[PDB]
Amino acid sequence: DKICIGYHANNSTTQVDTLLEKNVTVTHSVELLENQKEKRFCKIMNKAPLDLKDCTIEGWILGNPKCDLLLGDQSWSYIVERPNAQNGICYPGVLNELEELKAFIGSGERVERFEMFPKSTWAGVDTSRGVTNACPSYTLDSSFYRNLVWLVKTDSATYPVIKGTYNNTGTQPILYFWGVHHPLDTTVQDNLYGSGDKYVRMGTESMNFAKSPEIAARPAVNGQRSRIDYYWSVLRPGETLNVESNGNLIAPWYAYKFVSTNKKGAVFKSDLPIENCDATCQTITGVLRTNKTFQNVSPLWIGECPKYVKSESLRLATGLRNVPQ
Amino acid sequence: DKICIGYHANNSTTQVDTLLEKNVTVTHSVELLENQKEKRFCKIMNKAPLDLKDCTIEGWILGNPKCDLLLGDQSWSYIVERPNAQNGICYPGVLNELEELKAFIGSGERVERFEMFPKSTWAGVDTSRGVTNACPSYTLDSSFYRNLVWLVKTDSATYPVIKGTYNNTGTQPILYFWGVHHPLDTTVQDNLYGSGDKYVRMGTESMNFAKSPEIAARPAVNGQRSRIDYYWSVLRPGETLNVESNGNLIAPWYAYKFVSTNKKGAVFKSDLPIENCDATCQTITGVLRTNKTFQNVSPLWIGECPKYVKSESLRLATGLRNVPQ
Amino acid sequence: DKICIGYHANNSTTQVDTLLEKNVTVTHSVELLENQKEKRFCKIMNKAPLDLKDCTIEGWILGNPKCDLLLGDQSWSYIVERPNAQNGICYPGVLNELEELKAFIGSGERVERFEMFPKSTWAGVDTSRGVTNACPSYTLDSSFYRNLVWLVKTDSATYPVIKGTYNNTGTQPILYFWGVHHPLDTTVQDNLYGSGDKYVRMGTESMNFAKSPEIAARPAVNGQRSRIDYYWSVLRPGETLNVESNGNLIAPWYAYKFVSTNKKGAVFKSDLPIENCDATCQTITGVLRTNKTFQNVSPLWIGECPKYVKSESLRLATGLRNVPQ
Amino acid sequence: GIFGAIAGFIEGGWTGMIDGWYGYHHENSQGSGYAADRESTQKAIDGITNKVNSIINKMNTQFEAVDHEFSNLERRIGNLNKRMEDGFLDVWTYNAELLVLLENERTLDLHDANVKNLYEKVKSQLRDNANDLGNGCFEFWHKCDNECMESVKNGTYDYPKY
Amino acid sequence: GIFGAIAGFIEGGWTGMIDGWYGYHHENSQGSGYAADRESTQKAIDGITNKVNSIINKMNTQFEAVDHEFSNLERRIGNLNKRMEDGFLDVWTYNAELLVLLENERTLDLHDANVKNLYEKVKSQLRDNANDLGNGCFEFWHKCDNECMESVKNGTYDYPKY
Amino acid sequence: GIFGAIAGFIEGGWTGMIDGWYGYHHENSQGSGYAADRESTQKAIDGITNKVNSIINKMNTQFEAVDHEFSNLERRIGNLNKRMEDGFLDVWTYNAELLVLLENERTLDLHDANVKNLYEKVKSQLRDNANDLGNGCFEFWHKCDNECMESVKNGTYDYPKY
Ligand SMILES: *[C@@H]1O[C@H](CO)[C@@H](O[C@@H]2O[C@H](CO)[C@@H](O[C@@H]3O[C@H](CO)[C@@H](O)[C@H](O)[C@@H]3O)[C@H](O)[C@H]2NC(C)=O)[C@H](O)[C@H]1NC(C)=O
Ligand SMILES: *[C@@H]1O[C@H](CO)[C@@H](O[C@@H]2O[C@H](CO)[C@@H](O[C@@H]3O[C@H](CO)[C@@H](O)[C@H](O)[C@@H]3O)[C@H](O)[C@H]2NC(C)=O)[C@H](O)[C@H]1NC(C)=O
Ligand SMILES: *[C@@H]1O[C@H](CO)[C@@H](O[C@@H]2O[C@H](CO)[C@@H](O[C@@H]3O[C@H](CO)[C@@H](O)[C@H](O)[C@@H]3O)[C@H](O)[C@H]2NC(C)=O)[C@H](O)[C@H]1NC(C)=O
Ligand SMILES: *[C@@H]1O[C@H](CO)[C@@H](O)[C@H](O)[C@H]1NC(C)=O
Ligand SMILES: *[C@@H]1O[C@H](CO)[C@@H](O)[C@H](O)[C@H]1NC(C)=O
Ligand SMILES: *[C@@H]1O[C@H](CO)[C@@H](O)[C@H](O)[C@H]1NC(C)=O
Ligand SMILES: *[C@@H]1O[C@H](CO)[C@@H](O)[C@H](O)[C@H]1NC(C)=O
Ligand SMILES: *[C@@H]1O[C@H](CO)[C@@H](O)[C@H](O)[C@H]1NC(C)=O
Ligand SMILES: *[C@@H]1O[C@H](CO)[C@@H](O)[C@H](O)[C@H]1NC(C)=O
């Protein structure tokens, strides 16, 4: 008669590493890391992402005539910008504080387009001839940004002082744009704005702006040696904006009532397909569907994701050393 | 006859957690984390903090007439700014590089106010009429910053070129301020500085400054549609400052000899009372009096503080499992 | 007859620390930390470092006449700048975005000096008289930067509009410099550039520049109350640069074809000797020759270095407690 | 294993004991069989489940990298952002990989200790009345039926009988 | 406990032994009493005091968050500062909480091992001359007065006598 | 040591056993000598070599501080860079110093356990046929020549003989 003390063995070939020993077969274990992604974009919190398609962030938000698909109100859980999008700043020039603008827009959730300054705001100037073959639409070969208006001189009487005002009486901050034109030579200047020292000045309770045209021929881009200095700002609730100019003003026409996000905000530069699905965790290179603690797919995500880590595997032993006989 | 081997038990109900087991009662243990604060501000190294009371940092350091309580020399272990302080920049405008100024002042320990340019520095201009109802004192309803002087035109002869110079021959850097006035229209401009293109230029061995007035009507703030561009810089030992202007100059009158701190430096935005007590460790939300290693009160402090951590408790077992019978 | 079980002891006096006990003598152990340096600079990847000797980074890259030793093409594994180098910006003024320039140059591996705008580029101006006693060479007492040309007015006919163009048709980005002169008074201005509002304008497919002279007397530096605003930019492959000016232009003469590094890049401010030796690991305070995992010599290095750590020692036990008898 | 039981003086495991981690093999007149010791098995399951869950909870924060862009004149702060993001990635990769290697070693020791103690609990009960064969088996000097076997396993073996 | 003594084969502690962590209960003609083993108790006190102090010393640096402000056009570097400060807060919270859970487990094992070894030291001295009752108690086959008791505790028990 | 063998019931080491970490001293008619147990010594060498190498591999990343400069109007981002670099320096100094203290303690316990198990392997083979002196030595009740000695060390001692 006999009794023996012993321990469990099974058919496991799953291995773990320890400080003392590599490749130890154990009876039970749990993997803590996810290396698997669904290569696509999905909804987050059942809210859809905004696909920019063939428009860049600048083209979308400036109102590039070839981005009419996007034009208006948008709600997004995150933004997807395609690497080869061709429709950005069509009339050559620099968008100032571009990286800060992207960060701002990334922190958002919804925009509402509304008319901020109707064209009839600007007394004694032409608002109907501000087009360019650098900004074709899909129909006209000479158009312009849907959110700006290129003000030119009338008949030939001198470019008067024009003025505009907007008191933001709502509850949301307003994102708006404007520009300063820089002709290539002094005759183009004269043909459009007449003679004299020109200025563009702008102010709120907390912001000041003032600039003059800087006439010079730059290398041609989209058939233009002239330039526009694009600007953006945010009009806070209760604040009022005054515009004063006597020439070279690319005026703010339409603007955006901006809803800031409570969550995180993402702008994914990717080619991945957007599909009709849900997710709680979306990385830039795909969806993760897991309960696992770590992942080695991407450090970049929106949603509730596992900790990013460079490891191939993080297998924790739970059972004991497997010694079958 | 018998001898037994055994271990200590006692009346402890204090528990610790381990990897294998929660809520284990142990005979002895030590808590490493402090969660207790004295909700007040005290002296650090037996040196008192500077209470700004109803003045903001800008109002204090610009010499806002309603901040006369603070005016002059100050020594501080740290600075306390009250959330509802009303006395800041009274005449509307932007203090340039404001965040860098706050960081600079935060790194300091003591200022000595001294007269840098006496009003008699500026030949052929009026130095006695530069006041405004936007800057009331507690007596006069139209005053101005104690550290600046708003230079205006005399009788009506044209705003001449004025000039000032200061060689810093001392051992300490000098913090000083100046401004450029921007009237709302061209007649206010003419009434104060006369006609012609105006400039404000400033230079040291290592710094250059040059700006022109930018005339435009901004939304009214404290009853003004005009603006001032406030500036600050630091004159290093051995350096010399030259001022040249023919109008729109808010001149540097008084400045500060600045003593940089060897320690850390803090600017606490808080409502907490300052009292008559000592401390070695002061956080933004209260004093810690401990020998403990961790604390979950605040990441923000001055003095010698324990490591900030988000944990409720960090109780270390020292004795053994408590098994009384 | 007897058999005993026992363990190894030896003559070791080497000690380790454990959580439970300090200064435990063990039979075998390994030290993981290196505290030893060779106080010198060596080659990395068998490529030599660039010694600036008596020139600073600015003097080298601007072409300060006393830096002719360095002038031309250079290849470097890293750069060594001597603390007491006297040859920097000789004609007083600020190099704009200086810290970004240093970071840029630090990310590089090789420059090729080439003539970007021959002096004959600028029609109707003098290119032969732009010298100054603030910039002596080792022979002439009045010279100027080898990479810039101070354009002055001819005979006395008025400073015409000058123009230059360079299409970068190569595969490498081009680092180039230029300036704007700021005379101390209006007569020096007139003597050099004549009358009228002057400008310096510059543009590529992605960059715009425009500035005017700001006339004012600054404190004297190297015998000058005038100033130069130095600038730098990078012309990308495929891009073209246009220069337009009617006065005050310090023109780009020579520039640098720039090879960006695949590795890390370092700029060491040190007095240490450069010698004829090889190394895989070079810190700012010396060479490390080790297989060890940690080092407490420096956080600043180029090459393949061990982890920097503040510890005096990190001795790992391998053998057992040494109990000789 | 530092306790010397698993793949030690008990050379191998029992694929036949499918209902638990540690237990017994008995052999008497009524035959043979495997049975898990449910007390020590369950105690280990609770401890190890607690350890897994504690690790999962301490690792339930995430460092969040961002999409922010930097111009050609922001090389310094762009590189500051990169080095910081990479900095945290390296400490968390270190923390996770080291923790797993350490916890795995101690987990195997835990099982090894539990088998050892189980063996000691039985040796302590039987004393004179069984022969310790040196491999985790005890040969009884007296007949041990099923209730006798079960009293050894439930720790109430009655030495003064038999 | 992995060594099997504390709340193991010695089921409970002694509230009566107030002067130390580990020790003895003796019972002879002169009566009964508790006494701490001062050597093993003091050795444990030194080790654990050293462990506490080492933890306190390694944790004696502080990451310092700052009051610095950022304008509306410095959202990127402001957020860089926040994510970094939060980044370090999370690794130190992780380091501290994990360390305490790990150290607590090993501390309890330490005490458990020390009781076990103390029990072994006594069993090794007595051998034939006492009966091991299985619960940490030994019944002597010979009379053991106070000097006999004390020689067991100071580890100089003289087997060849008695 | 928590296992109680090294500087425990085996009070000291053997400077005479130069060819390994753990082993034996035998004494019979043919004389005396030291011999390493090569199996347990080699197993320990592999484990500890693995531990050293694993630590070295997990520590094979480097946080890289940079030379970048900051103007007088970049005090905030300059200080952000300093606090971050110092931040990582402190966590890695913490990680390395704590790891070494922890690993050293467990390494010594490992050796201590291995000597203990080696002692147990021998006691288990000999049983009745030798007297355990309490210090790691066994006195045989029968003559044990060199092949007998060697069968104890290679774990094939034949009890039913002698
Ligand atoms: C541990 O295992 C032992 C053995 O299985 C358990 O002892 C057994 O207890 C049962 C009752 O609980 C006894 O059966 C009784 O027998 C009488 C007739 O004599 C009958 O009238 C009762 O109704 C009952 O069936 C059994 O004899 C006894 N086995 C022995 C003494 O060898 C013990 O209860 C177990 N303890 C625990 C805590 O599980
Ligand atoms: C460990 O405990 C034992 C027992 O308490 C200690 O042995 C005892 O030692 C004392 C002296 O140190 C002995 O007393 C002596 O007796 C003679 C008369 O025979 C007297 O003339 C001396 O002045 C002295 O009082 C005592 O008999 C003896 N007990 C025995 C042998 O049972 C032992 O010293 C202790 N060892 C350590 C290291 O603490
Ligand atoms: C463990 O050690 C024992 C003792 O050293 C080993 O047993 C020994 O094995 C050898 C052969 O391998 C035996 O020698 C033989 O003797 C016969 C004559 O009787 C001869 O004809 C053979 O050629 C050979 O020399 C030796 O007697 C025997 N010692 C005993 C039984 O005490 C054993 O092999 C070792 N096992 C391992 C796994 O190392
Ligand atoms: C050992 O582990 C490596 C990876 O950890 C694996 O590729 C290899 O197949 C393993 N070898 C054995 C024998 O299990
Ligand atoms: C608009 O702004 C002005 C400030 O210029 C303020 O006085 C007025 O009340 C505002 N109007 C509304 C409807 O809020
Ligand atoms: C277990 O621990 C939690 C917090 O750690 C405490 O709230 C609870 O009362 C504890 N339960 C017992 C039974 O000690
Ligand atoms: C003041 O500055 C000038 C430089 O313009 C210098 O030459 C002079 O020595 C300085 N004076 C004193 C008292 O340091
Ligand atoms: C103990 O360690 C310290 C440094 O760790 C050393 O200076 C001292 O000499 C050591 N003391 C002994 C007795 O080894
Ligand atoms: C130089 O640049 C112009 C753009 O202005 C381009 O059209 C031309 O092809 C370029 N020349 C070469 C040789 O690349």
Q: Distance between CA atoms of E26 and A292, rounded to whole angstroms?
A: 55
Name C248's Cβ contacts closer than 8 Å, sequence gap at least 6. C180, C181, C182, C193, C198, C199, C200, C212, C213
Q: Distance between CA atoms of B147 and B251, rounded to whole angstroms?
A: 9
Contact B59, B69 (CB under 8 A): no
- From the number of C-beta atoms within 10 Å of its C-beta (0-12, 13-18, 19+), residue E129 rates as middle
Is ligand 7 within 6 A of the CB of residue C161? Answer: no
Is ligand 5 within 6 A of the CB of residue A171? Answer: no
Contact E47 C20 (CB under 8 A): yes
- Cα–Cα–Cα angle for E134, E137, E140, rounded to 5 degrees: 110
Contact A58, A97 (CB under 8 A): no
Residue recorded with tokens 């140059």: C105
Task: Count CB-CB contacts under 10 A for residue B208.
Answer: 16
User: DSSP secondary-structure letter at C273?
Assistant: P
- The residue whose CA has the least distance to atom 3 of ligand 1 is D151
Six-digit token string for A313: 């595997």
Q: Distance between CA atoms of E83 and D84, rounded to whole angstroms?
A: 10
**Which helix H or strand E contains A196, and what residues bound it?**
none
- The residue whose CA has the least distance to atom 1 of ligand 4 is A23
| Test the B interface: residue of D49, D51, D103 with most B CBs within 10 Å | D51
Judged by a CB distance cut-off of 8 A, whether residue A217 touches chain C is: yes
Give the gap in angstroms from C-alpha C112 to the nearest C-alpha of chain B: 31
Residue recorded with tokens 């960081």: B103
**What length does chain A have?**
325
User: Helices E75-126 & E38-58, crossing angle to 10 degrees?
Assistant: 170
Q: Distance between CA atoms of C314 and F96, rounded to whole angstroms?
A: 8
Six-digit token string for F39: 């199996």
Contact A176, A233 (CB under 8 A): yes
**Which helix H or strand E contains E151, and what residues bound it?**
helix E146-153
**What length does chain D have?**
162
Q: Distance between CA atoms of C55 and C51, rounded to whole angstroms?
A: 9
Q: Distance between CA atoms of D113 and A301, rounded to whole angstroms?
A: 43
Distances (CA, A) of D11 to B205, C278, D1, D3: 84, 55, 12, 13
Q: Distance between CA atoms of C222 and C134, rounded to whole angstroms?
A: 6
Q: Which residues line ligand 1 (CB under 6 A)?
A: D 147, 150-151, 154, 156
Give the gap in angstroms from C-alpha D84 to the nearest C-alpha of chain F: 7
Per the entry, the structure determination technique was X-ray
Q: Check: CATH 3.40.190.10 for A42-275? A: no
Size of interface D-F (CB pairs under 8 A): 54
Judged by a CB distance cut-off of 8 A, whether residue A204 touches chain B is: yes
Judged by a CB distance cut-off of 8 A, whether residue C218 touches chain B is: yes
Is ligand 6 within 6 A of the CB of residue B46? Answer: no
Six-digit token string for B168: 């810093």
Contact B309, D58 (CB under 8 A): no
Q: Distance between CA atoms of C215 and C226, rounded to whole angstroms?
A: 8
Ligand 8 atom nearest the C-alpha of C17 is 5
Name D25's Cβ contacts closer than 8 Å, sequence gap at least 6. A3, A4, A6, D14, D16, D17, D32, D33, D34, D137
Distances (CA, A) of C273 to B222, B293, C51: 64, 45, 10
Distances (CA, A) of C189 to C90, C197, C244: 20, 11, 19
Six-digit token string for B42: 């005290």
Q: How far, in Å, is the centroid of ligand 7 from the Cα of B238? A: 7
In 3-state terms, what secondary structure has residue B78? coil
**Residues of chain B contacting residue E130, judged by C-beta atoms under 8 Å apart:** 3
Give the gap in angstroms from C-alpha B150 to the nearest C-alpha of chain E: 28
Q: What is the CATH number of domain F1-162?
A: 3.90.20.10
Contact B275, B289 (CB under 8 A): no
List the domain boundaries for chain D: 1-162
Distances (CA, A) of B55 to B64, B70, B137, B284: 8, 9, 13, 19
Contact A3 D70 (CB under 8 A): no
- The residue whose CA has the least distance to atom 6 of ligand 8 is C23
**Residues of chain A contacting residue D27, judged by C-beta atoms under 8 Å apart:** 1-3
Any idea which fold B1-41+276-325 has? Answer: Hemagglutinin; Chain A, domain 2 (2.10.77)
In 3-state terms, what secondary structure has residue B182? strand
Q: How far, in Å, is the centroid of ligand 1 from the Cα of D152? A: 13
Closest by CA to D67, choosing from A33, A105, A110, is A105
Q: Distance between CA atoms of C266 and D22, rounded to whole angstroms?
A: 60
Residue D8 amino acid letter: G
CA torsion A241-A247-A253-A257 (nearest 10°) is: -30
Closest by CA to B201, choosing from C171, D135, C213, is C213
CA torsion B100-B106-B110-B114 (nearest 10°) is: 20
Residue of E nearest to B267 (CA): E67
Cα A204 to chain centroid, rounded: 25
Contact D84 E84 (CB under 8 A): yes
Q: Distance between CA atoms of B273 and B270, rounded to whole angstroms?
A: 9
- CA dihedral sign, ordered B138, B144, B145, B149: negative
Compute the half-sphere exposure of residue A6: CA atoms within 13 Å on the CB side of its CA.
26
- Give me the DSSP letters along A9-30: --S---EE--SS-SSEEBS-EE
Q: Which of D9, D83, D93 sits opposite F64 (nearest CB)?
A: D83
Six-digit token string for B296: 């979950």
Q: Which of E56, E74, E143 sits opposite B1 (nearest CB)?
A: E143
Name A12's Cβ contacts closer than 8 Å, sequence gap at least 6. A25, A26, A27, A28, A319, A322
Contact E147, E38 (CB under 8 A): no
Q: How far, in Å, is the centroid of ligand 2 from the Cα of E155? A: 13
Residue A88 amino acid letter: G
Residue B171 amino acid letter: T
Q: Distance between CA atoms of B240 and C220, rounded to whole angstroms?
A: 9
Contact E68 F87 (CB under 8 A): no
Closest by CA to A196, choosing from A246, A244, A245, is A246
Q: What is the CA radius of gyration of chain D?
A: 26
Q: Distance between CA atoms of C242 and C233, rounded to whole angstroms?
A: 13
Q: Name chain D's partners: 3 or more CB pairs within 8 A.
A: A, B, C, E, F
Helices (H) and strands (E) in chain A, counts: 3, 28
* Header resolution in angstroms: 2.6
| Test the C interface: residue of E54, E99, E102 with most C CBs within 10 Å | E54
| Test the F interface: residue of A18, A19, A23 with most F CBs within 10 Å | A19
**What length does chain F have?**
162
**Which helix H or strand E contains A40, and what residues bound it?**
none
Distances (CA, A) of A188 to A143, A218, E85: 19, 14, 53
Q: Distance between CA atoms of B66 and D116, rounded to whole angstroms?
A: 81
Compute the half-sphere exposure of residue B306: CA atoms within 13 Å on the CB side of its CA.
22
Q: Distance between CA atoms of A263 and E84, rounded to whole angstroms?
A: 18
Give the gap in angstroms from C-alpha E124 to the nearest C-alpha of chain F: 6
Contact B191, B59 (CB under 8 A): no
Is ligand 5 within 6 A of the CB of residue A285? Answer: no
Q: Distance between CA atoms of F92 and C91, rounded to whole angstroms?
A: 46
Q: Distance between CA atoms of A214 and A117, rounded to whole angstroms?
A: 26
Is ligand 4 within 6 A of the CB of residue A13? Answer: no
Q: Which residues line ligand 2 (CB under 6 A)?
A: E 147, 150-151, 154, 156
Name A146's Cβ contacts closer than 8 Å, sequence gap at least 6. A63, A64, A65, A68, A71, A253, A254
For ligand 8, mutation pick of C12, C14, C15 (most atoms within 8 Å of CB):
C15
Q: Which of E3, E4, E87 sits opposite D88 (nearest CB)?
A: E87
Contact B123, B44 (CB under 8 A): no
Residue recorded with tokens 């490498």: C172
In 3-state terms, what secondary structure has residue D141? coil
**Which helix H or strand E contains E98, and what residues bound it?**
helix E75-126
**Residues of chain E contacting residue D75, judged by C-beta atoms under 8 Å apart:** none
User: Helices A98-106 & E75-126, crossing angle to 10 degrees?
Assistant: 60
Q: How far, in Å, is the centroid of ligand 2 from the Cα of E147? A: 7
Residue C174 amino acid letter: I
Contact B221 A208 (CB under 8 A): no
User: DSSP secondary-structure letter at F95?
Assistant: H
Contact C204, C174 (CB under 8 A): no
Q: Distance between CA atoms of C127 and C118, rounded to whole angstroms?
A: 10
Reported for C195-199, long-range contacts at CB under 8 A and 24+ positions apart, including other chains, are C195/C158, C196/C158, C196/C159, C196/C246, C196/C247, C198/C159, C198/C245, C198/C246, C198/C247, C198/C248, C199/A214, C199/C245, C199/C246, C199/C247, C199/C248
Size of interface B-D (CB pairs under 8 A): 15
Ligand nearest to the CA of D148: 1
Closest by CA to A151, choosing from A126, A117, A182, is A126
Name C84's Cβ contacts closer than 8 Å, sequence gap at least 6. none
Six-digit token string for B244: 């040249």
Phi, psi of F88 (to 5 degrees): -70, -35
Residues of chain E with a following break (C to N over 2.5 Å)? none
Give the gap in angstroms from C-alpha D30 to the nearest C-alpha of chain B: 39
Q: Name chain B's partners: 3 or more CB pairs within 8 A.
A: A, C, D, E, F
Six-digit token string for C14: 């080497």
| Test the D interface: residue of C19, C96, C99, C100 with most D CBs within 10 Å | C100
Contact A285, A297 (CB under 8 A): yes
Q: How far, in Å, is the centroid of ligand 5 from the Cα of A242? A: 13
Six-digit token string for A223: 């058939």
Six-digit token string for C184: 């101390």
List the domain boundaries for chain C: 1-41+276-325, 42-275
Judged by a CB distance cut-off of 8 A, whether residue F109 touches chain D is: yes
Contact B208 C221 (CB under 8 A): no
**Residues of chain C contacting residue B210, judged by C-beta atoms under 8 Å apart:** 214, 216
Q: Which of E77, E110, E124 sits opposite F9 (nearest CB)?
A: E124
